[PDB]
Amino acid sequence: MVYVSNKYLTMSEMKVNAQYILNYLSSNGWTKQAICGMLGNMQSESTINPGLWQNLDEGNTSLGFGLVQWTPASNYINWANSQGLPYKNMDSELKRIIWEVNNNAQWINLRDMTFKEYIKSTKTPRELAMIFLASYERPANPNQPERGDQAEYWYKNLS
Ligand SMILES: CC(=O)N[C@@H]1[C@@H](O)[C@H](O[C@@H]2O[C@H](CO)[C@@H](O[C@@H]3O[C@H](CO)[C@@H](O)[C@H](O)[C@H]3NC(C)=O)[C@H](O)[C@H]2NC(C)=O)[C@@H](CO)O[C@H]1O
């Protein structure tokens, strides 16, 4: 059970999606801290919503889409289409992230941590959130300390 829409999610809806992601990536070898650092980012990017378009601008593939706001959306959507996966889908977006770790895509090592180090890290959710922000997301505004608060929130409130 997950929410997938082009709409901002409430805290209760986010928590449903966030527990789902935690469970999924735990089975694929990620630490709870690394997952929660990324969740802190996904909350700012998309309110942890796999259906979310940047500005709620549905169908604009030049802009951000999905949990981490792949920008241009086509970066992700072309890959899903090419792989035979439905693009507007929680698991499809999670499979993209695993694909990126495996193929060293998306990540630029700006904090002396590789993507493979990151998913195995037991540093704080706050620290990992800031690393993930700087290395993976890289938005125009680098100053979003909220992502670290949010990572700590999920680490505390999820199982
Ligand atoms: C207005 C705004 O901030 N829009 C946000 C997007 O900027 C952001 O997506 C990220 O955009 C950056 C900068 O364009 C991307 O980084 C670039 O990626 C390419 C890799 O092909 C590389 O050539 C550049 O060196 C690199 N530039 C920099 C400065 O790092 C980055 O890949 C995008 N991130 C993702 C996940 O797709 C998204 C996500 O934060 O949010 C928009 O709101």
Taking CA atoms only, the protein residue closest to ligand 1 atom 25 is 108
Determine the distance from the C-alpha atom of residue 132 to the mean position of all C-alpha atoms in its chain, rounded to a whole number. Answer: 9
Taking CA atoms only, the protein residue closest to ligand 1 atom 17 is 138
3 state SS for 129-145 = HHHHHHHHHCCCCCCCC
Technique employed here was: X-ray
| C-alpha pair distances (Å), 133 with each of 53, 106, 137 | 19, 12, 5
- Catalytic residue list contains 127: no
* Ligand 1: centre distance to CA 69 (Å): 9
| C-alpha pair distances (Å), 100 with each of 43, 85, 94, 126, 145 | 20, 16, 10, 22, 25
Question: Could you state, in order of their start, the residue ranges of all structural domains in the chain?
Answer: 1-159
Residue 72 CA: which ligand 1 atom is closest?
37
Experimental resolution (Å): 1.8
Indicate the CATH number for domain 1-159: 1.10.530.10
Taking CA atoms only, the protein residue closest to ligand 1 atom 11 is 139
Any known ligand binding at 106? yes
Find the angle CA(147)-CA(150)-CA(156) to the nearest 5 degrees.
145
- Please state whether the peptide bond connecting residue 72 to the residue before it is cis, i.e. omega within 30 degrees of 0: yes
